[PDB]
């Protein structure tokens, strides 16, 4: 039943997922004046050159672009991380208007949307084992602002038509996620959680400083997707973001 509506929204998740009120919930507001540079942070290694995308799926709250994670084809290493983390999927969160949609905020600023590249710690063997551990997952988060089109995104935008409703999927091979990165890999990092139920506290968040630009036309096509299944009454897929959660006992570090 969970979702983003008035009766099943984030305000309600704690009832079925008590960890929602936990000590290391995501997302959070990034107070730039309180984040601290950490010169001990090693440089971030994004190695997506052999990434193998497979499929795109409308899961009822967003769409996932899924990848083959049977081997070390696309990985995240270095930065705050120990070991190797394999890309399993990416998705977005976006708003009903350009003034909202991101999950993380920067000095309370909300971007139009946010891209999450989800990776799991290969020493745990699979994703399911990984989300039983405090260092199981690493998510690369990238803000989207509305401006010029992102060429690298257009392929995704153009398949949306075919996965309009919940549980629809389409073939999605040969997509290169490198085309969704900004120039700079400067980041902020903190320990957190999934921002969707079950809200497991297993994530090392790495949030890039530099947003990517996407066109209004591109984001408009995101807002034409549906939460609902086929034949059901249309509920447009918008505002599928969880607001900022309390930082509690956590420090956000800057790589720059
Ligand atoms: N939003 S997020 O990046 O915290 C996130 C979302 C999903 C995750 C994992 C993470 Cl870390 N897993 C999936 C399962 Cl369907 Cl494989 N659901 S999700 O909401 O896309
Ligand atoms: Zn869902
Ligand atoms: Zn997400």
């Amino acid at each position: 039943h969970w979702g983003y509506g008035k009766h099943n929204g984030p305000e309600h998740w704690h009832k079925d997922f008590p960890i929602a009120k936990g000590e290391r919930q995501s997302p959070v507001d990034i107070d730039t004046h309180t984040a601290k540079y950490d010169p001990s942070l090693k440089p971030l290694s994004v190695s997506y050159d052999q990434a193998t995308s497979l499929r795109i799926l409308n899961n009822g709250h967003a769409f996932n672009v899924e990848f083959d994670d049977s081997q070390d084809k696309a990985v995240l290493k270095g930065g705050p991380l120990d070991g190797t983390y394999r890309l399993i999927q990416f998705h977005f969160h976006w708003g009903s208007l350009d003034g909202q949609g991101s999950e993380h905020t920067v000095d309370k600023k909300k971007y139009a949307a946010e891209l999450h590249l989800v990776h799991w710690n290969t020493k745990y063997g699979d994703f399911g084992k990984a989300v039983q551990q405090p260092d199981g997952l690493a998510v690369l988060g990238i803000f989207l602002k509305v401006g010029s089109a992102k060429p690298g995104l257009q392929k995704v935008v153009d398949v949306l038509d075919s996965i309009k409703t919940k549980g629809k999927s389409a073939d999605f091979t040969n997509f290169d996620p490198r085309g969704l990165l900004p120039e700079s890999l400067d980041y902020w990092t903190y320990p957190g959680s999934l921002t969707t139920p079950p809200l497991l506290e297993c994530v090392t968040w790495i949030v890039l400083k530099e947003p990517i630009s996407v066109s209004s036309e591109q984001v408009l096509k995101f807002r034409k997707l549906n939460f609902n299944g086929e034949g059901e009454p249309e509920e447009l897929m918008v505002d599928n973001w969880r607001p900022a959660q309390p930082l509690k006992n956590r420090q956000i570090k800057a790589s720059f």
Side-chain angles (χ1 to χ4, degrees), residues 1-5 7-248 250-256:
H1 275 11
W2 76 270
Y4 295 94
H7 312 276
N8 64 358
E11 274 325 319
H12 301 268
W13 296 352
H14 71 100
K15 289 182 277 163
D16 286 291
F17 308 97
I19 200 44
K21 292 177 130 58
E23 306 299 294
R24 81 174 253 199
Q25 289 295 286
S26 294
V28 303
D29 178 55
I30 299 162
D31 192 272
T32 63
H33 290 108
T34 300
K36 189 178 169 338
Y37 176 65
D38 179 2
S40 98
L41 283 168
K42 281 138 65 219
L44 198 54
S45 177
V46 180
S47 303
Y48 285 171
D49 122 278
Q50 292 304 159
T52 303
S53 71
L54 270 25
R55 183 175 90 134
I56 184 163
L57 165 71
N58 180 329
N59 55 28
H61 61 269
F63 60 86
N64 295 330
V65 172
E66 310 160 347
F67 291 78
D68 169 9
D69 60 346
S70 65
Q71 308 169 265
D72 278 7
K73 280 184 215 222
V75 298
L76 186 53
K77 305 168 49 55
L81 306 172
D82 314 332
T84 299
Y85 291 69
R86 224 178 262 189
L87 184 60
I88 174 164
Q89 55 110 327
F90 67 77
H91 59 270
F92 305 79
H93 310 258
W94 60 92
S96 42
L97 300 162
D98 299 348
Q100 64 185 217
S102 69
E103 292 204 308
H104 294 92
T105 53
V106 176
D107 295 334
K108 301 282 178 100
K109 182 195 167 65
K110 301 180 164 96
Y111 290 87
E114 184 172 335
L115 164 64
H116 289 157
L117 299 121
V118 182
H119 316 75
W120 59 271
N121 198 332
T122 61
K123 74 187 225 227
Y124 296 123
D126 64 44
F127 178 86
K129 272 32 165 252
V131 302
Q132 292 184 224
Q133 315 285 324
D135 57 357
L137 303 183
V139 184
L140 184 58
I142 307 177
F143 298 114
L144 277 59
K145 61 201 207 125
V146 179
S148 312
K150 191 76 164 169
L153 187 59
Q154 197 44 44
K155 258 192 258 232
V156 178
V157 157
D158 278 340
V159 78
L160 256 30
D161 255 333
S162 77
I163 59 136
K164 185 201 214 197
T165 49
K166 193 202 339 171
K168 289 180 122 243
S169 73
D171 177 288
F172 205 63
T173 53
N174 302 106
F175 176 81
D176 194 338
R178 288 178 300 190
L180 298 167
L181 306 177
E183 290 204 333
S184 198
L185 288 193
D186 290 338
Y187 59 91
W188 296 288
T189 175
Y190 76 98
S193 74
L194 273 65
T195 67
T196 51
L199 306 171
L200 302 171
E201 295 180 339
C202 316
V203 184
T204 296
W205 278 97
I206 299 170
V207 174
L208 298 192
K209 175 137 160 226
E210 184 193 331
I212 60 174
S213 285
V214 303
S215 69
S216 51
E217 291 74 16
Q218 287 184 317
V219 74
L220 252 130
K221 271 138 174 250
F222 288 24
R223 307 178 183 136
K224 280 173 183 78
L225 290 163
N226 282 191
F227 284 126
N228 56 275
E230 181 193 359
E232 296 168 19
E234 229 207 9
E235 230 350 71
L236 291 172
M237 186 179 276
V238 298
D239 290 315
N240 52 0
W241 48 280
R242 184 193 202 195
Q245 300 309 302
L247 189 54
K248 315 259 209 162
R250 290 177 287 178
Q251 284 267 202
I252 300 181
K253 309 188 279 159
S255 75
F256 62 94

